[PDB]
């Protein structure tokens, strides 16, 4: 099956753009990344950085994840991110999202060898 690392890339990485450029970004990306196939995923974050810079976070500041696990890491720098959140008009299969662009630190959970991001925990 798809690996956890690959799933993180598909769900969260967008190195092809520096920022969301229109209100439609989330609608397009949630659909194109297959995140709305079975249900409307309610929230998701895309990161507009190189993959290597995001993978490097696994070597940065160790912190507790929101659920208490201790394999989370916070980026030293802020990163360009886009938050996608379902709107009130969203109704499967026509899932609809609000796009918000921001520059925040990211918190990811890492696993494996090589030790890589597998879960997006939070932005702060």
From Swiss-Prot:
Resulting phenotype, residue 12 to A: Loss of activity
Cystine residue pairs? 26-84, 40-95, 58-110, 65-72
Q: Which enzyme class? A: lyase
Q: Where is the active site?
A: 12 (proton acceptor), 119 (proton donor)
E.C. no: 4.6.1.18
Q: Which organism is it from?
A: Bos taurus (Bovine)
Q: Could you describe the subunit structure of this protein?
A: Interacts with and forms tight 1:1 complexes with RNH1. Dimerization of two such complexes may occur. Interaction with RNH1 inhibits this protein. Monomer.
Any one GO CC term of the record: extracellular region
Q: Which domain of life is it from?
A: Eukaryota
First and last residue shown, out of the full length, are 27 to 150 of 150
Q: Which UniProt keywords apply?
A: Disulfide bond, Endonuclease, Glycation, Glycoprotein, Hydrolase, Lyase, Nuclease, Secreted, Signal
Would you tell me the protein name for this molecule?
Ribonuclease pancreatic
List ligand-binding residues for substrate: 7, 10, 41-45, 66, 85
Q: Which GO terms describe its biological process?
A: defense response to Gram-positive bacterium
């Amino acid at each position: 099956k798809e690996t956890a690392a690959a799933k993180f890339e598909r769900q969260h990485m967008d190195s092809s753009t520096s920022a969301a450029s229109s209100s439609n970004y989330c609608n397009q990306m949630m659909k194109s990344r297959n995140l709305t196939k079975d249900r409307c995923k309610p929230v998701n974050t895309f990161v507009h950085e190189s993959l290597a810079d995001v993978q490097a976070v696994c070597s940065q500041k160790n912190v507790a994840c929101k659920n208490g696990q201790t394999n989370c890491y916070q980026s030293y720098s802020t990163m360009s991110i886009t938050d996608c959140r379902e709107t009130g008009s969203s109704k499967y299969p026509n899932c609809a999202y609000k796009t918000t662009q921001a520059n925040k630190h990211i918190i990811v959970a890492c696993e494996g060898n090589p030790y890589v991001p597998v879960h997006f925990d939070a932005s702060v």
